[PDB]
Amino acid sequence: SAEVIPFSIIEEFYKRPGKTLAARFFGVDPFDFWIGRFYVGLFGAISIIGIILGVAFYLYEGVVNEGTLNILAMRIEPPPVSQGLNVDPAQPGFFWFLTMVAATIAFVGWLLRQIDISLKLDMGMEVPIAFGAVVSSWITLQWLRPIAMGAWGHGFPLGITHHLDWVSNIGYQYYNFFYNPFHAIGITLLFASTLFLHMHGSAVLSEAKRNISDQNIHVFWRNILGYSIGEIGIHRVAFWTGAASVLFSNLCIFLSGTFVKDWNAFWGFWDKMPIWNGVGQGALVA
Amino acid sequence: PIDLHDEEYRDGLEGTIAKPPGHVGWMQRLLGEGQVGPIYVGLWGVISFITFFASAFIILVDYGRQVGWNPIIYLREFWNLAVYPPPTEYGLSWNVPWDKGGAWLAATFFLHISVLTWWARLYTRAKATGVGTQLAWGFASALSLYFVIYLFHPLALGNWSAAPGHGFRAILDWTNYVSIHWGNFYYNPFHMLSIFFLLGSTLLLAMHGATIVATSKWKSEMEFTEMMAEGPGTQRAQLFWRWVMGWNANSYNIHIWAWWFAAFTAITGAIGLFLSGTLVPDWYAWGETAKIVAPWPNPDWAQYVF
Amino acid sequence: RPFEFRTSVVVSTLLGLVMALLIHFVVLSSGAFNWLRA
Amino acid sequence: DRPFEFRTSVVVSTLLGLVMALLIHFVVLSSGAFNWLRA
Amino acid sequence: DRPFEFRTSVVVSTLLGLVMALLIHFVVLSSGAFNWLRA
Amino acid sequence: RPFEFRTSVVVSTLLGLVMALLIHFVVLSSGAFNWLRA
Amino acid sequence: DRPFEFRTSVVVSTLLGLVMALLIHFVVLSSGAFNWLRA
Amino acid sequence: DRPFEFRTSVVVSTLLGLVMALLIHFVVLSSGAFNWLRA
Amino acid sequence: RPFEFRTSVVVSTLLGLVMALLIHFVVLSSGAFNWLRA
Amino acid sequence: DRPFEFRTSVVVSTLLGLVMALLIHFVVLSSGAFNWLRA
Amino acid sequence: DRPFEFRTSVVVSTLLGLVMALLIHFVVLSSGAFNWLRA
Amino acid sequence: QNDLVPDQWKPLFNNAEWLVHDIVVKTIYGGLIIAVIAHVLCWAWTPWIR
Amino acid sequence: QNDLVPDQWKPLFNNAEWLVHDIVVKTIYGGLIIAVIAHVLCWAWTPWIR
Amino acid sequence: QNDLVPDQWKPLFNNAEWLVHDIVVKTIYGGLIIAVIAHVLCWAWTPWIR
Amino acid sequence: QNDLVPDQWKPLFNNAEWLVHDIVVKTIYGGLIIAVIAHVLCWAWTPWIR
Amino acid sequence: QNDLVPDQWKPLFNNAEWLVHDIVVKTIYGGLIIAVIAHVLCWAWTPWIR
Amino acid sequence: QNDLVPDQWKPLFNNAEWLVHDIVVKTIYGGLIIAVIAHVLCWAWTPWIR
Amino acid sequence: QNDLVPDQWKPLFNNAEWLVHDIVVKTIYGGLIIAVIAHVLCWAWTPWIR
Amino acid sequence: AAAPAGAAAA
Amino acid sequence: SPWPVWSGYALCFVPLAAVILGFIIAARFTDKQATSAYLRLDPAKAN
Amino acid sequence: MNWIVATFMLMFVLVAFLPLVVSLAYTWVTNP
Ligand code: BCL
Ligand code: BCL
Ligand code: BCL
Ligand code: BCL
Ligand code: BCL
Ligand code: BCL
Ligand code: BCL
Ligand code: BCL
Ligand SMILES: CCCCCCCCO[C@@H]1[C@@H](O)[C@H](O)[C@@H](CO)O[C@H]1O
Ligand SMILES: CCCCCCCCO[C@@H]1[C@@H](O)[C@H](O)[C@@H](CO)O[C@H]1O
Ligand SMILES: CCCCCCCCO[C@@H]1[C@@H](O)[C@H](O)[C@@H](CO)O[C@H]1O
Ligand SMILES: [Mn+2]
């Protein structure tokens, strides 16, 4: 049934030509080969072009145009909001735009490449979905929100410590950001994700090199919490929670400059509902 | 020598309740398992239950006292009521009025006892079956940050008001206040490490779940039998990540990555928070002396004004 | 045997200790007795 | 067979009636139109 | 077989009666209409 | 048996203790009685 | 088999004594009623 | 086989009707066009 | 069983209901017509 | 068979040389010591 | 069976020495006690 | 099983369900009568429509 | 099963579902009548279109 | 089993459930009498409808 | 079962689905007529284009 | 197993449960007596109704 | 293992349980006297009821 | 095993457990004596009841 | 003999 | 002086280097373990 | 604010939710 295989047979068995997206559109993939361990294809060349160009533009904007060799003191900044949605090569923010665009290509290319590989091994499409969640996070932050606001100057600066000044100033401009309901849902899902990861790691490690059966862990997880989830359901819950964490956070940041200006005022309706307004006296009114 | 049936269907204090077990259908369809119960109760599970509900009783009765024993105002104001630690004029003293800090002290003591006995329950139930004690030490790493937040940081600062209040809105307020007090928390480097590990944990959880669900036609999620001989699903997962990243992992050491990435978050957080007030009273000024703050001489402030 | 003696002993002992601690906390916070005063 | 069970309909009706009664009593008390419970 | 089990009905009735008793006692106490526990 | 005596005993004991504690807290917080005043 | 275990009672007693000692020391020494470690 | 079960249609219609009745009542009450529970 | 028809009718009904509610609120809050006025 | 491969050495050397050339060009341009690309 | 391996000792010693040397050099450099690389 | 249920409602009701249904119907009728009386008394006290 | 259901609606309704459907349609008719009367009375009280 | 239960309520009760039911109804009757007296006394003290 | 449904859309509809589709289209047409009447009445009340 | 239990309550109790029940009822009676005395003393101290 | 328990309490106690029960009752009797003395001394110190 | 244990306590203790029990009781007695001395010394220093 | 977890069982 | 303070090296740059180096080493050992020869099911028969 | 561009961007943000919903529906349908 099982014997010792040296993993070269494993890799040689599963290599096949042409089951990708480009092979289904054009009839052939122009780059259907492997370099080293990596698989190159269409969307693997596009991604690498984007990566190289983005790195070069970032470093040119940082070292030149700012005159600093300190990587933690750079401010790779967008144009001012007075420029609107216009791009001009003779104005300061231009290289930021270039970098941003290049990164988008790289990220999108990466996603499509994963689909290709999923099609080569006859798998499901779960990894592209989970990664597309965070690619949509990037697109919401850098494309949709600045276009809805009306300027490229609403996007985030790309410095290592300076993109956090944007987070601080945006968070305190719409004070109090903790009172954002989608923000709270996202934080809840992040904390739950880390808890679930620790629990699954502990559970699988606790039964590894032991002369027991596979039912000991179910009895353990049923003596402690009263419910054991199973082996397909732990991994399903992991996938779903990880994706939803950022999916709900997209709304929190999109709705900040649009439709809302203050998250303390958002709750002003709660005490004015007819069921309980006008029932206390003193500092207990409203 | 472990009899699983006896471990799940015994009577007494050292036994289980919620027998005969139940069954939920939608959990069976979505999650694959639907049986609920039985649940073990022992000595360490009855000391946690009673102490938790003692603390909860104290908190809820104080809520009712603040509202004025009015159920309608209680329902209206539930999510912004809180029990707060004694103010700064008192030090670490316990001679405080009940409505100005005594209730907080009592409830926090009982919560301490409950979490400790829950740790003991996890440890002993792990040993009662045949499995290792890895959830217990993960909970210990999680409890390090809890005890820094509620016990040790106030002790080293010298007042109980450095600790959070007991409420829905009070934890967010504590987060805001503690960041504002000690400079800016974005320039805390152990805060940066904690964020690194938290976001990496979420990344890794999503990746592992997606790749195991994707190759589940060949039963790759039965990770107990895959650690003895690997079949087509694990081989496909390995090839996927090798052709994407250039390196892959096993059906064994991936869960090692998971355990350690989840554990480092709480430890780095505990260290950063403890250092936050006692050695470095201002993180922006420190970061300015350490050359990690960008100059920013001509900001475009029209973005930040309505 | 419907009732176990050990459960009764454990529950009663724990409840007694919890009540003693709670009463001591309340009386200390009240300030009526001199006790640990300045 | 039967589309609904009698037990489910009974439970739903009881819960809905209780919630409705509480809601209407609260609204009327907070409106201030009737004397009722006054200091 | 049987639509409702008697034990569940007894438990639900007991809990509902207790909750209503507490709610009405607290409403009347905090309304301030009756003298009751004052100063 | 449809009814277990142990469950009824446990529920009654817990409910009596909780009610006694609640009544004591409400009555002391009321301020109507001269009880434990500094 | 045995209704009561001696090892469990020993562990519980030791933990209870340690917790009580720490709590009483902290409560007594933070009151300010004793002249202990004064600059 | 059927495109829709009768139970789901009944449940959806009942829930929608209840929600719409509540919404219309609250909108009309808040408008102020009618006297209703004044004072 | 095909999922196309039920999905199409469900999404159509949801779209119609949401659009009707939105248009009614927009017209009400504009004051162009008398409708519900004090 | 052999401790080192010729191909890996060629690839590593090419990558390192390319990166170093780009970095030195950027640094020398940023220094301002040469009148190289000025308006 | 040996308790320790020689390889582990060598690796740990080398890593510890390198980290210590870098730390001491950079601590002494920024103290200002010695002239050294002073503009 | 389905003995006292009328033949019209046999595909829907059982004996126990029929008895519980009768109880529920009588309770609802009594509640409706009491609610009508309460509303009449409240209107006689203070009308809520002016 | 398909005994009281008319021949046109055999593939849709069961024997119990036909009776439930009849109850539902009668309830809807009664509710519509009551709603019409209520709307007429409210218009008599205070017209909402001027 | 269904020996002390009357013939009408056989499909719903046992002997044990019948005894518990009798206890419950006696308790409810006593509580209702006490509640009526309490309400009369509280009205004689201070009327709550003015 | 594929009866009374034309062969063009047989790979999509059954007979029950055919009946449901017929009901849906009839409802749509009735709603469209009522909407046209409503818009005419509202225009006669207050025109929105001037 | 059911010798001490009276004939009426055999379907609900054992000997052990009967003994425990007797203990419980005696404790409740003692507690009620003490509570009555405590309430009388408290009213003599300060009446809670004015 | 039932030779020290009285015949009345055989269906509830064991030898070991009877011994531990004796210990518990003696401890409770001892604690009650100390509690009474402590309360009398505290009242002599400062009464808590005025 | 069960050799040095007195006949009364056989169903609860053992040999090793009996030895550990003796160690524990001696430790408790010594600690109590030390605690009494410490309390007397502290009261001589500063009385905590005023 | 050689196994995925790194254990060499007989 | 153009230099950071000593706590800048102790709190920022040493942990950064340690994280990067530890990630590289852990990845190297993980990949070495995963691509070795051990018990596997035969891909030809199992598929 | 344009309010027409903002609505299209909001619709894109919402349609970013679709693959996870399809994943949940696929799991429900394929596991009867
Ligand atoms: C004030 C500054 C001066 C200037 C001063 C200098 C000085 C000084 C030098 C250059 C050199 C170069 N300059 Mg100049 N240069 C200026 C401005 C420019 C501008 C511009 C638009 O302004 C451009 C496009 C260039 C372009 C160039 C390149 C042609 C050249 C870098 C070669 C290289 O990349 O090696 C890397 C190339 C590789 C392919 C990487 C591999 C190299 C490694 C180290 C060895 C491995 C070889 C490999 C194994 C062989 C295998 C075969 C390969 C696969 C093909 N300079 C200004 C005017 N410039 C360098 C030169 O002449 O090199 C020949 C050089 O020394
Ligand atoms: C204005 C707000 C400040 C800020 C102020 C703070 C403060 C103050 C702190 C953090 C801390 C953290 N911040 Mg921050 N933080 C900011 C912005 C961010 C941003 C962002 C994108 O902007 C992110 C991702 C983070 C992320 C984080 C986390 C990495 C870290 C805490 C995680 C954790 O382990 O909690 C998990 C919590 C626990 C493990 C303890 C509680 C739970 C334990 C296990 C006990 C629970 C048992 C319970 C009682 C049982 C009852 C339950 C029953 C079932 C009913 N912050 C800004 C700068 N942040 C914390 C930190 O670690 O500092 C380094 C911290 O103290
Ligand atoms: C009079 C002053 C207020 C008003 C205040 C209230 C209040 C307050 C209530 C109502 C309720 C009702 N009002 Mg009104 N109502 C007003 C004006 C209106 C107008 C109008 C056009 O103006 C309408 C259409 C209504 C309509 C209604 C009905 C929806 C409802 C009574 C029927 C019912 O379902 O309960 C009849 C009940 C049954 C059929 C079920 C039987 C319940 C039995 C009796 C169990 C009771 C539990 C018992 C106390 C527990 C003891 C048990 C023993 C221990 C064994 N009201 C005005 C504005 N109205 C009630 C409601 O919503 O109930 C759901 C309600 O509580
Ligand atoms: C909710 C509290 C208790 C309970 C409390 C009581 C009380 C109290 C009584 C019963 C009675 C009965 N209960 Mg019971 N009973 C409970 C739950 C159940 C369950 C169950 C499925 O769980 C079942 C099957 C039963 C079965 C029964 C029957 C054996 C028995 C007679 C019913 C009857 O003929 O009245 C059918 C008639 C009606 C339902 C009409 C009464 C409702 C009125 C109209 C509501 C308003 C009353 C008010 C005064 C107005 C009256 C005049 C109106 C204007 C017309 N009970 C729960 C556990 N039950 C009765 C009995 O005879 O005891 C032996 C009785 O008095
Ligand atoms: C907290 C409750 C305690 C309990 C405490 C008591 C006490 C105290 C007594 C009993 C008694 C009994 N208990 Mg018991 N008993 C409990 C639970 C049970 C359970 C169970 C299934 O859990 C069962 C089967 C029983 C069984 C029994 C019977 C053996 C016995 C007779 C009941 C009776 O008189 O019926 C008929 C029921 C009634 C007559 C109830 C009527 C009482 C009044 C009407 C209640 C309303 C009070 C009202 C405010 C004031 C009334 C004044 C009015 C003007 C009338 N108990 C729980 C654990 N039980 C009685 C006995 O004699 O024991 C030997 C008794 O005195
Ligand atoms: C008059 C003032 C406003 C105006 C106010 C409104 C309002 C308010 C509404 C419309 C709606 C419509 N308007 Mg207009 N409209 C105006 C000017 C225009 C102009 C124009 C160029 O001037 C155009 C092209 C339109 C176009 C439209 C359509 C998009 C739509 C009518 C189609 C429809 O609903 O039938 C489609 C038919 C169906 C969808 C069948 C479904 C209906 C069935 C009968 C169910 C009804 C529900 C029923 C209440 C449930 C009862 C159940 C029982 C109790 C069991 N309007 C002016 C500016 N308009 C409506 C809409 O958006 O609806 C979707 C709407 O509510
Ligand atoms: C609680 C901490 C320790 C422990 C500490 C001690 C100490 C100390 C002693 C014992 C002693 C005993 N322990 Mg031990 N023992 C423990 C655990 C156990 C366990 C178990 C399985 O858990 C068992 C079966 C036992 C069993 C025993 C017996 C062998 C022996 C009891 C003699 C007796 O008849 O007491 C029945 C008598 C009483 C209970 C006296 C009641 C005490 C008084 C009345 C109440 C407190 C008041 C206060 C002390 C002042 C009294 C004045 C009043 C005003 C009258 N221990 C735990 C681990 N144990 C005793 C012994 O070995 O001496 C020969 C002894 O001195
Ligand atoms: C005098 C000033 C304070 C006061 C301050 C303290 C402090 C501080 C303590 C007590 C403790 C006690 N006090 Mg006092 N206490 C006061 C007033 C009171 C009053 C009163 C009505 O006024 C009462 C009834 C008490 C009663 C008590 C008991 C609950 C307890 C007695 C100790 C014991 O049980 O030893 C039982 C025997 C042992 C615990 C044996 C110990 C075993 C060994 C000796 C452990 C020591 C560690 C070892 C030496 C470390 C060396 C390491 C090497 C490797 C060996 N206190 C006043 C207000 N009290 C102590 C306590 O709670 O401990 C449980 C305690 O720490
Ligand atoms: C789904 C979120 C919680 C809501 C649970 C109740 C909704 C209806 O839940 C039903 C279950 O009752 C039924 O057993 C399964 C199929 O076995 O199908 C589900 O739709
Ligand atoms: C996390 C929530 C767990 C409890 C869910 C409560 C509603 C469960 O509802 C389930 C139904 O979904 C199921 O079809 C039937 C039949 O088995 O059993 C019920 O318990
Ligand atoms: C055993 C746990 C550590 C005990 C340390 C006690 C610290 C006491 O610290 C207290 C302060 O909290 C108190 O406010 C002032 C009053 O002037 O006196 C100090 O000694
Ligand atoms: Mn796993």
Whether R46 contacts chain C with CB within 8 A: no
* 8 A C-beta contact, residue A75 and residue A63: no
Residues U32 and U30: their CA atoms lie apart, in Å, by 6
Q: In one letter, which amino acid is A84?
A: G
DSSP chain B: ---HHHHHS--SSSEEES-S-EE-HHHHHHHS--EE--EEE-SHHHHHHHHHHHHHHHHHHHHHHHHTS-HHHHHHTGGG--B----TTS-S-S---GGGTHHHHHHHHHHHHHHHHHHHHHHHHHHHTT--S-HHHHHHHHHHHHHIIIIIHHHHHT-GGGSPPBSTTHHHHHHHHHHHHSS-GGG-HHHHHHHHHHHHHHHHHHHHHHHHHHTGGGTTT-HHHHTTSB-HHHHHHHHHHHHHHS----TTTHHHHHHHHHHHHHHHHHHHHHHHHHT-S-HHHHHHHTT-S----S--GGGG--
How far from chain centre, in Å, is Cα B273? Answer: 15
- Residue S2 DSSP class: B
3 state DSSP class of Q49:
strand
Which ligand approaches the C-alpha of residue A197 most closely?
Answer: 12
Which residues have C-beta atoms less than 6 Å from ligand 1?
J 10, 13-14, 17-18, 21, 28, 34, 36
Chains that touch F (3 or more CB pairs under 8 A): B, C, E, N, P, Q
Question: Rounded to an integer, what distance in angstroms lies between the CA atom of residue A285 and that of residue A280?
Answer: 5
Comparing alpha-carbon positions, the chain A residue that sits nearest to S3 is A4
Element (H, E) at L29: helix L15-45
Alpha helices in N1-50 (DSSP H): 15-45
HSE-CB at U2 with a 13 A cutoff on CA atoms is: 14
Q: Are A157 and A73 in contact (CB under 8 A)?
A: no
Cα dihedral A115→A116→A120→A126 (10° resolution)? -10
The secondary structure of chain P in percent helix, strand, coil, rounded to multiples of 5, reads: 70, 0, 30
- Interatomic CA distance for residues C32 and C30, integer angstroms: 6
Nearest alpha carbon to residue A29 among A44, A14, A15: A44
Contact of chains K and T by CB distance (3 or more pairs under 8 angstroms) = yes
Q: Residues near G2 by Cβ (< 8 Å), separated by ≥ 6?
A: Q16, R11, R12
What's the Cα-to-Cα distance from C4 to each of B14, C9, K35, S7, rounded to whole Å? 11, 9, 82, 46
Query: How far apart, in whole angstroms, are the C-alpha atoms of residue E7 and residue T38?
Result: 59
The whole-angstrom separation of Cα B26 and Cα U28 is 9
In angstroms, the CA B71 to CA E26 distance is 7
Q: Left (φ > 0), alpha (ψ -120 to 50) or beta: where does F37 sit?
A: beta
Question: Maximum CA pair distance of chain A?
Answer: 80
Q: Residue B300: which of A148, A261, A82 has the closest Cα? A: A82
In a 10 Å sphere around its CB, with 0-12 CB exposed, 13-18 middle and 19+ buried, how is residue B68 labelled?
middle
Rounded to whole angstroms, how far apart are CA atoms U14 and T41? 44
What is the CA angle O37-O43-O49, rounded to 5?
Answer: 140
Is C31 annotated as ligand-binding?
Answer: no
As a whole number of angstroms, the distance between CA Q39 and CA L5 comes to 70
- Lookup result for tokens 């259907």: A32
Tokens read off for D3: 């589309």
Are the C-beta atoms of residues B146 and B115 closer than 8 Å to each other?
yes
Enumerate the residues of chain T whose CB falls inside 8 A of the CB of residue S6.
33
Nearest-Å Rg of the Cα atoms of chain O is: 18
What CA–CA distance (Å, rounded) separates A126 from B209?
9
Ligand 10 centre to CA of A227 (Å) is 13
Longest pairwise C-alpha distance within chain R:
55
Q: What is the spatial distance between Cα I23 and Cα I9, in angstroms, rounded to a whole number?
A: 21
Strands B15-17 and B39-41: antiparallel
* CA A18 and chain centroid, separation: 30
Cα–Cα dist F17/B274, whole Å: 41
Using H for helix, E for strand and C for coil, what is the string for U1-32? Answer: CCCCHHHHHHHHHHHCCHHHHHHHHHHHHHCC
Residues in chain F: 38
- Give the count of alpha carbons within 13 A of M4, CB side only: 14
Q: Do L50 and H37 touch (CB under 8 A)?
A: no
* Structure tokens belonging to residue G8: 């469990």
Locus of tokens 């967010």: B172
Closest Cβ opposite residue L48 in set D10, D33, D35: D33
Residues with CB under 6 A from ligand 3: D 17, 20-21, 24-25, 28; H 37; L 27-28, 31-32, 35, 39, 42, 48; N 28
| Residue of R11, F10, Q24, A197 lying closest to B41 (CA atoms) | F10
Do you know the residue count of chain T?
47
CA-only gyration radius of chain D, Å: 17
| Widest distance between CA atoms in chain J | 58
Residue A84 CB coordination number (10 Å): 12
**Subunit partners of chain E (3 or more CB pairs within 8 A):** B, D, F, L, N, P
Which residues, 6+ apart, have CB-to-CB distance to T47 below 8 Å? Answer: B232
Distance CA N11, CA N13 (A): 6
Whose structure tokens read 């002992």? C13
**Per the omega criterion (within 30 degrees of 0), is the bond before C2 cis?**
no
Say how many C-beta atoms besides its own lie within 10 A of residue U21's C-beta: 10
Q: Can you tell me which residue has the tokens 């990690």?
A: B292
Other CB atoms within 10 Å distance of the CB of residue A204? 23
The technique is cryo-EM
Residue ranges in chain R assigned as alpha helix (H): 15-45
- Run of H or E residues at J15: helix J6-31
Contact B230, T39 (CB under 8 A): yes
Could you say which ligand is closest to the alpha carbon of residue I27? 6
Q: What are phi and psi of D9, to 5 degrees?
A: -65, -40
Are U1 and A258 in contact, with CB atoms under 8 Å apart?
yes
Q: Distance between CA G27 and CA R48 in Å, rounded?
A: 13
Using an 8 Å Cβ cutoff, are E3 and P14 in contact?
A: no
Distance CA A127, CA B206 (A): 8
For residues A180 and A160, what is the distance between their CA atoms, to the nearest angstrom?
26
Question: What are the tokens at H34?
Answer: 């009618």
Residues 6+ apart with CB under 8 A from N13: E6, N2, N5, N21
Backbone φ/ψ region at J38: left (φ over 0), alpha (ψ -120 to 50), beta: beta
Phi, psi of B12 (to 5 degrees): 100, -175
| Cβ of residue R45 lying under 6 Å from some atom of ligand 8 | no
Test the F interface: residue of C30, C33, C35 with most F CBs within 10 Å: C30
Mutate to test the pocket of ligand 2, among B149, B150, B178, B191 (most ligand atoms within 8 A of CB): B191
- Per the document, the length of chain P is 50
- E26 annotated among ligand-binding-site residues: no
Rounded distance from Cα B32 to ligand 9 centre (Å): 14
Residue A285 to residue M34: CA distance in whole angstroms: 40
Tokens found for residue H24: 């219309």
- In sequence order, the 6+-apart residues with CB closer than 8 A to the CB of H35 are L49, L50, M46
Segment (H or E) for T41? strand T38-41
Residues of chain P in contact with residue F3, where contact means CB-CB under 8 angstroms, are: 12
Per DSSP, the residues of chain A read -EEEE-SHHHHHHS--S--SHHHHHTSS-TT-EEETTEEE-TTTHHHHHHHHHHHHHHHHHHHTTT----TTS----PPPGGGTT---TTSTTHHHHHHHHHHHHHHHHHHHHHHHHHHHTT--SHHHHHHHHHHHHHHIIIIIHHHHHT-GGGSPP--TTTHHHHHHHHHHHTS-GGG-HHHHHHHHHHHHHHHHHHHHHHHHHTTSSSS--TTHHHHHHHHHSSB---SHHHHHHHHHHHHHHHHHHHHHHHHHHSS-S-TTGGGGGGGGSTTTTT---STT--
Buried b (16+ CB within 10 A) or exposed e, B211-234: bbbbbbebebbbbbebbebbbbbb
**Spatial distance between the Cα atoms of I1 and D20, rounded to a whole number of angstroms:** 40
What type of residue is B248?
N
Residue list, ligand 4 pocket, CB within 6 Å: E 4, 6, 9-10, 13; L 20, 23, 26-27, 30, 33-34; N 9, 12, 21, 24-25, 28
Task: Taking the CA atoms of P34, P37, P41 and P47 in sequence, report the sign of the dihedral they define.
Answer: positive
Closest atom of ligand 5 to F5 CA is: 22
Beta strands B39-41 and T38-41: pairing type?
Answer: unpaired
- Residue A100: CB atoms within 10 A of its CB come to 23
Here the tokens at position A256 are 């900040």
Give the integer Cα–Cα distance in Å for T30 and T23. 10
Counting one residue from A and one from T, how many pairs have CB atoms under 8 Å apart?
Answer: 25
Task: Quote the CA–CA distance of J20 and I10 in Å, as a whole number.
Answer: 61
Three-state DSSP string of T10-40: HHHHHHHHHHHHHHHHHHHHHHHHHCCCEEE
Q: Which two tokens stand for residue Q38?
A: 């402590």
Q: How big is chain Q, counted in residues?
A: 50
Can you tell me the distance from the alpha carbon of N13 to that of N5, in angstroms, rounded to the nearest whole number? 7
| Three-state secondary structure string covering B131-142 | CCCCHHHHHHHH
The three-class DSSP label of residue F35 is: strand
Residue with tokens 């040095």: R4
Distances (CA, A) of B263 to A30, B175, B258, B259: 45, 21, 9, 6
Pocket-forming residues, ligand 11, beta carbon under 6 Å = B 91-93; G 22, 25-26, 29-30, 32
Question: Structure tokens of E22?
Answer: 């507490």
Read off the tokens for A96: 């930021």
Residue holding tokens 């989840």?
Answer: B262
For residue S8, the SS3 value is strand
Distance CA A27, CA A30 (A): 10
Q: Is Q33 in the pocket of ligand 7 (CB under 6 A)?
A: yes
Q: Nearest chain A Cα to D26, which residue?
A: A275
Q: Can you tell me which residue has the tokens 């429509």?
A: L49
Q: Between chains, do A13 and T44 touch, taking CB under 8 Å as contact?
A: yes
Exposed (0-12), middle (13-18) or buried (19+): which is T23, by Cβ within 10 Å? Answer: exposed
Interface H:I, ≥3 CB–CB pairs < 8 Å? yes
Q: Do chains D and N touch (3 or more CB pairs under 8 A)?
A: yes
Beta pairing partners, J3: none
Residue whose entry in the numeric block shows the structure tokens 């709270």? A184
